């Protein structure tokens, strides 16, 4: 199976390949995620984890003669993911609540909401989590999340960049549309904090769902004559806002995307998209992961079933590649921490040395290696010292044309490249 790989040490993989709206349930059981809505870019990230491990297993210098295996899961519902979590933490398919296990670390989850639900269970025994996508600012607090690290930045940094973009231009009334979840509400809090002492005025804000009456939202934004709309939200919600914007004759706005949808592949090619105005955004620069294309051409218990054959390899390859390097780096950070915990040399590892998850953690914290010419390190908070942001613009060819840069240790924009709809 794609979801399981035998090995000497196992890494957990927490992914959400399918999407489903939250709904009442009356039985205590897992959701059949395989029958729900497939998400192509998430599957790509899922593969990126499988590729990274296989790459490391192919290596004779990183974990020499020590295989890495994984248990991976498709948790379309944060509430229903505990069986998979229980499996990672179980000591022989049992959990004993009172002890000082299956896996040595875990990669994921993708969203702050998944993370907040399960992280305490992992924190309690200093089981390391290395999230490839959870950007809630609260995870920067080591006292709350002592064994939590991540390879994407906090919302504060992304919010900073977004405010940089706004200050680069002349508009100072702003609408902040944000997802009705912890990720969205966090961005709102960060957005507010940053712009409080500044010329920028939050003129409208709303927590949004796929259920939201967007006609009323946009009526309110137009009545207030707000030109700039920040949509701080994941794929499903961003497509909700923007598809509704096209359908409800919204024009002449300046849209600003966070990196969760600035590289969306569905919206730029959409009929009518050019009419809502100009889409700007903060994006993760496309990192080339040598060997991944070939790997895809080769690759094509509950929540371990994709049900996604008859899948186009070119669709998958061209999907939104954001969070690729974060996944790639998360797996590698963990493998390096194991390598260094076992005290492996260039040639060999000691073996049948048993490694308690917490032992991995101090090596994870001290991570310091190069990976595709980037340096992988974490600061005091377990936040990443690597990765940057592009400023992009959606051009009339349906491409997110880069027009500028944000580097976290101190923004430039070539304003002439931006064509205004």
């Amino acid at each position, epitope marked *: 199976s794609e979801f399981h790989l035998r090995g000497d040490y196992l890494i957990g993989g927490l992914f959400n390949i399918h999407y489903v709206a939250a709904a009442n349930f009356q039985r205590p059981q897992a959701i059949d995620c395989s029958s729900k809505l497939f998400i192509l870019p998430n599957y790509r990230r899922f593969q990126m984890m499988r590729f990274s491990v296989e790459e490391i297993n192919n290596s004779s210098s990183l974990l020499p003669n020590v295989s890495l295996g994984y248990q991976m899961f498709d948790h379309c519902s944060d509430i229903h993911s505990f069986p998979g979590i229980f499996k990672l933490l179980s000591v022989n398919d049992l959990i004993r609540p009172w002890e000082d296990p299956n896996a040595i670390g875990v990669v994921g989850p993708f969203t702050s909401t998944h993370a907040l639900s399960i992280a305490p269970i992992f924190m309690t025994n200093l089981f390391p989590m290395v999230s490839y996508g959870c950007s809630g600012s609260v995870f920067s607090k080591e006292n709350l999340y002592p064994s939590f690290l991540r390879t994407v930045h906090s919302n504060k940094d992304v919010i900073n960049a977004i405010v*940089g973009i706004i200050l680069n231009f*002349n*508009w*100072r*009334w702003v609408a902040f549309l944000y997802s009705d979840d912890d990720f969205g509400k966090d961005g709102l809090e960060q957005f507010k904090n940053k712009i409080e002492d*500044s*010329e920028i005025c939050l003129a409208f804000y709303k927590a949004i769902n796929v259920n939201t009456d967007y006609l009323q939202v946009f009526k309110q934004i137009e009545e207030q*004559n707000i*030109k700039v709309i920040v949509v701080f939200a994941p794929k499903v919600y961003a497509e909700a806002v923007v598809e509704s914007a096209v359908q409800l004759n919204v024009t002449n706005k300046v849209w600003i995307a966070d990196d969760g949808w600035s590289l969306n592949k569905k919206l730029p090619s959409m009929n009518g998209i050019q009419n809502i105005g100009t889409v700007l955004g903060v994006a993760q620069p496309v990192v080339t992961i040598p060997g991944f294309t070939d790997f895809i051409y080769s690759a094509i218990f509950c929540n371990q079933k994709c049900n996604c054959s008859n899948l186009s390899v070119k669709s998958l390859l061209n999907a939104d590649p954001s969070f690729s390097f974060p996944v790639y780096a998360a797996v590698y950070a963990i493998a390096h921490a194991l390598h260094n915990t076992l005290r492996c040399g260039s040639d060999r590892c000691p073996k049948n040395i048993t490694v308690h998850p917490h032992m991995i953690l101090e090596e994870l914290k001290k991570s310091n290696f190069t990976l595709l010419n980037q340096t992988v390190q974490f600061d005091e908070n377990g936040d990443p010292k690597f990765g940057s942001l592009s400023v992009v613009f959606w051009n009339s060819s349906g491409n997110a044309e880069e027009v500028g840069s944000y580097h976290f240790q101190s923004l430039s924009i070539n304003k002439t490249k931006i064509k205004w709809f």
Partner: antibody, heavy 124, light 112 residues
Framework: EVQLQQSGPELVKPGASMKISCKAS????????MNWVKQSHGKNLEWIGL????????TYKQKFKGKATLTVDRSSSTAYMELLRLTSEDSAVYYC?????????????????WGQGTLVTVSA | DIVLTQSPASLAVSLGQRATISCRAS??????????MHWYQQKPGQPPILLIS???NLESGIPARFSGSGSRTDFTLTINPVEADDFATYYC?????????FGGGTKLEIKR
């Protein structure tokens, strides 16, 4: 409290150039446009231009292009205005003034905070 | 450039009476559902003080005896009742178009 502290009165020779400073405290310097205003005795107020201290972008009233130069120093939270090739017609009081909060654009901002003014006398 | 003509240029109002100052714009200063006409007070030797923004918003710390009204191209500043410390030059300013422009000013004198 928000304070805009301008530099003291200046006597400058004709043909020469001089620089006026405006030191900002009590708020986030790069959050708001800094504006400059000319007042000649017999007092009309005239907008010279503004600067975005976050990125240094500038905007000038036409007649002041090549005459005034707005700059900032973020390390010290000071906005500067250099006047060039001075004539007796540049003798005036010059004000720095910060944009307020609530305007839809940087263009539409009004001036909520002013410096105390700098007298400039152009004379041999 | 939008021209602002204030009237009258000069005005004397007794203590406790009502003072009315006008500003006419050569072009509309309306945009974004607002009127970007503002009123400033300048006492002798001092920086101007913002009284009123966007045609009728009294700024914090300004007495309620000051008020503004109007839209598009016609604006009034009213002072009621006039007090002894109210002598000043009053400027209107539009910020609808670049460049910002000021009216010529109106000199308010306390009549006695």
């Amino acid at each position: 409290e928000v304070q805009l502290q301008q530099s003291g009165p200046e006597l400058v020779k004709p043909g020469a150039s001089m620089k006026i400073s405006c030191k900002a405290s009590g708020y986030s310097f790069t959050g708001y446009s800094m504006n400059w205003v000319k007042q000649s005795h017999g007092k009309n107020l005239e907008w010279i231009g503004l600067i975005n201290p976050y990125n240094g972008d500038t905007t000038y009233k036409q007649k002041f292009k090549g005459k005034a130069t707005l700059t900032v120093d973020r390390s010290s939270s000071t906005a500067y205005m250099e006047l060039l090739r001075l004539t007796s017609e540049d003798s005036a009081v010059y004000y720095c003034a910060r944009s307020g909060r609530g305007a839809p654009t940087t263009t539409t901002a009004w001036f909520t905070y002013w410096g105390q003014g700098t007298l400039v006398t152009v004379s041999a | 450039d939008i021209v602002l003509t204030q009237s009258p240029a000069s005005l004397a109002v007794s203590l406790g009476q009502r003072a009315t100052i006008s500003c006419r714009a050569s072009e509309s200063v309306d945009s974004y559902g607002n009127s970007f006409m503002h009123w400033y007070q300048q006492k002798p030797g001092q920086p101007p003080i913002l009284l009123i923004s966007r045609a009728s918003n009294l700024e914090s710390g300004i007495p309620a005896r000051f008020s503004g009204s109007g839209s598009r191209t016609d604006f009034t500043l009213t002072i009621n009742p006039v007090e002894a410390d109210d002598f000043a030059t009053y400027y209107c300013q539009q910020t609808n178009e670049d460049p910002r422009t000021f009216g010529g000013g109106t000199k308010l004198e306390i009549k006695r």
